[PDB]
Structure 1
Amino acid sequence: ASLFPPGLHAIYGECRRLYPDQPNPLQVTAIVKYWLGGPDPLDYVSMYRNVGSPSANIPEHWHYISFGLSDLYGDNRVHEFTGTDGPSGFGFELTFRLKRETGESAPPTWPAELMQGLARYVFQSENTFCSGDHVSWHSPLDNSESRIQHMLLTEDPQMQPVQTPFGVVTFLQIVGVCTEELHSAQQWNGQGILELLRTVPIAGGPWLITDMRRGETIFEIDPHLQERVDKGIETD
């Protein structure tokens, strides 16, 4: 009397189209669900292995997808049902791509935590996030010493918006960045820095993968990108 949640199924469906050979991936869950009084708004976080793409500049990475920001059950236990047209719940779920480090047999679990924190902001303030937005996390994302301490949001390069009997669901991918890059996004705009990040493989690449070990800003890597920012600001 807890069948496979329709909302969850729609997302799970997309996940399968992408990882047909990973039907039983590592999945993390809140021991006491939010709608039962728990502190974490995301009911589940699936963690897949993405081989990426040798050919392109795309390295092997871990891919995370959340469950809870959208309307999973459609019975008003967390979000209000609002037809199949509008957005399901908040309208999206968070995703994240973490560069795989040698000797990693499974995907590290800290990103679920990061997502719960972001989700917690959405649930309580009730303000949603959009592609291009930035979040001044102001702390190394994985509680390490990393220079990646903030976030930019963009649409997931592979996960496509899904139709649900409870509304549409899109996927917002988290992209870790350095404070200098965050400031740059504030001076100009998120979409601009996102474009730049795509041109610098080690900082994101086409799929905007995050490398928590990156020690340099895109600007330190290629001081010419600054020009591009200056022009953007100007012509905007």
Structure 2
Amino acid sequence: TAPPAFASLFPPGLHAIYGECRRLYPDQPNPLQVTAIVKYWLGGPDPLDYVSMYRNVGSPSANIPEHWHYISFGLSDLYGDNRVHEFTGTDGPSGFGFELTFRLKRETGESAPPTWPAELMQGLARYVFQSENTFCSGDHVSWHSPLDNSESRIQHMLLTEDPQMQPVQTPFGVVTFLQIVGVCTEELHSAQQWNGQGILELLRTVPIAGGPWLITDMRRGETIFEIDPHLQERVDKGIETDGSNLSGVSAKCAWDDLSRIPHELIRTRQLESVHLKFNQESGALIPLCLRGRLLHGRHFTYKSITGDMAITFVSTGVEGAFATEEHPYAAHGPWLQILLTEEFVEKMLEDLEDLTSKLPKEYSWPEKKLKVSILPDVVFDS
């Protein structure tokens, strides 16, 4: 409602973001910042000009922890004179369309916010700029490193809309706010197997993880599923409902013929009977591959990590597949495409209590000439 001091100095882009900040925190008009002094468009390594570091009381009254809030400047068009972003105009997204935020739970000893998350936001922005790929709500980041650089359990990231921050209309476009959320490797794998938003919704329930504002505690030693097993059950139901985002996986697998691009020999062979082979972990993905993908009219690919051999499960819905309901087992080279009808896969699932919820475990369908075997990995090692 009241303007900032020395307003004519601030660029209109930067002005609108700081507008949203002042709204949230009228108490701190001078929050500690991390500033880039060697600018990115001059040769500097850091794409983010400023990182404001606020403090939020939270609502322990409503069971929301006290935490440090971080907000970036640079990902959106701040200056609007084509120095780093092409001037888009008011319509559409400003710059890359968003600025990062992050919420780190306050520990003791902290009279001030740590600065490592600002350095993380730098490295994270380095990807966006060097690849021009744009993140949105639900997207994940395989960081494969403890975020604070600590030996901490939290090694990956999920991206959500910031609960407090409202999208703003700069004279250069709209700017949404994507809040970074730290996650465990296993919780990242869940978000790969199912949508990102649904896993976010799960994290919101568990207050320690967690919480409705998705505050990151780096001290968290166990995953949401170790905190609560009943959540594991709520994932599959979603994979049944929404489907799976995971389109394939590199894993120890093989396929054998039971019949009695490119080479290019100008022909591809079809098979009457087929025998598929998997490990424990790879064979443990079948339910989601079937229930999650084929029942949703999508496909799934297994590739062997050791060498050249692939199996692509296709539903009758896909296009371009060389396997039809009439000749369902078709192979080009060592790439086998298997086509399974919606009626047959429902039957397959009822014959598959795979995760017991001993090897080798074989499954036969003489009615369809299919044999799937789950066996120890020392085989594919050969």
Structure 2 Cα separation of the partners of residues 131 and 166 of structure 1: 21
Identity within the alignment, %: 100
| Structure 1 residue 103 displacement after superposition | 2.0
Structure 1 Cα separation of the partners of residues 146 and 37 of structure 2: 26
Give the SS at the match of 1:199. Answer: coil
Structure 2 Cα separation of the partners of residues 14 and 76 of structure 1: 24
Q: For structure 2, which runs of at least 5 residues remain unmatched after alignment? A: 1-6, 242-381
- 1:87-129 per-residue CA deviation (whole Å, 9 max, x = no partner) reads 1100000000000001211110000111011100000100010
Give the SS at the match of 1:152. Answer: strand
Structure 2 Cα separation of the partners of residues 214 and 180 of structure 1: 14
Structure 2 Cα separation of the partners of residues 43 and 204 of structure 1: 29
Structure 2 Cα separation of the partners of residues 173 and 217 of structure 1: 20
- 1:206-235 per-residue CA deviation (whole Å, 9 max, x = no partner) reads 100000110010000001100000111111
| Structure 1 residue 130 displacement after superposition | 0.5
| Structure 1 residue 85 displacement after superposition | 1.1
| Structure 1 residue 55 displacement after superposition | 1.7
Q: For structure 1, which runs of at least 5 residues remain unmatched after alignment? A: none
Structure 1 Cα separation of the partners of residues 110 and 22 of structure 2: 22
Write the mapping of 1:163-202 to structure 2, written as runs, cut at 5 A.
163-202=169-208
Give the SS at the match of 2:208. Answer: helix
User: Residue 112 of structure 2 corresponds to which residue in structure 1?
Assistant: 106
| Structure 1 residue 139 displacement after superposition | 0.4
- 1:109-160 per-residue CA deviation (whole Å, 9 max, x = no partner) reads 0001110111000001000100000100000001001110000000001011
**TM-score (ref. length: structure 2):** 0.61
| Structure 1 residue 31 displacement after superposition | 2.2
Structure 1 Cα separation of the partners of residues 89 and 24 of structure 2: 27
Give the SS at the match of 2:9. Answer: coil
Deviates more, 1:26-35 or 1:59-68: 26-35
Q: Does 1:8 align with 2:14?
A: yes
- Picking from 153, 158, 161, the partner of 1:155 is 161
Deviates more, 1:60-69 or 1:2-11: 2-11
Give the SS at the match of 1:55. Answer: helix
| Structure 1 residue 4 displacement after superposition | 0.7
Q: CA RMSD in A?
A: 2.7
Q: Between Structure 1 and Structure 2, whose CA radius of gyration is higher?
A: 2
User: Residue 268 of structure 2 corresponds to which residue in structure 1?
Assistant: none
Structure 1 Cα separation of the partners of residues 37 and 143 of structure 2: 25
Structure 1 Cα separation of the partners of residues 37 and 156 of structure 2: 28
User: Residue 33 of structure 1 corresponds to which residue in structure 2?
Assistant: 39
Write the mapping of 1:1-236 to structure 2, written as runs, cut at 5 A.
3-235=9-241
| Aligned pairs, number | 236
Structure 2 Cα separation of the partners of residues 216 and 64 of structure 1: 25
| Structure 1 residue 2 displacement after superposition | 8.7
Give the SS at the match of 1:96. Answer: strand
| Structure 1 residue 204 displacement after superposition | 1.5
Give the SS at the match of 2:124. Answer: helix
| Structure 1 residue 54 displacement after superposition | 2.0
- 1:150-193 per-residue CA deviation (whole Å, 9 max, x = no partner) reads 00000001011011011100000000000010000011110111
Give the SS at the match of 1:58. Answer: coil
Q: Which has the higher contact order (CA 8 A, sep 6+)?
A: 1
Structure 2 Cα separation of the partners of residues 33 and 200 of structure 1: 41
| Structure 1 residue 25 displacement after superposition | 0.3
Structure 2 Cα separation of the partners of residues 215 and 85 of structure 1: 45
Structure 1 Cα separation of the partners of residues 8 and 76 of structure 2: 18
- 1:55-111 per-residue CA deviation (whole Å, 9 max, x = no partner) reads 211010000000000000000000000110111100000000000001211110000
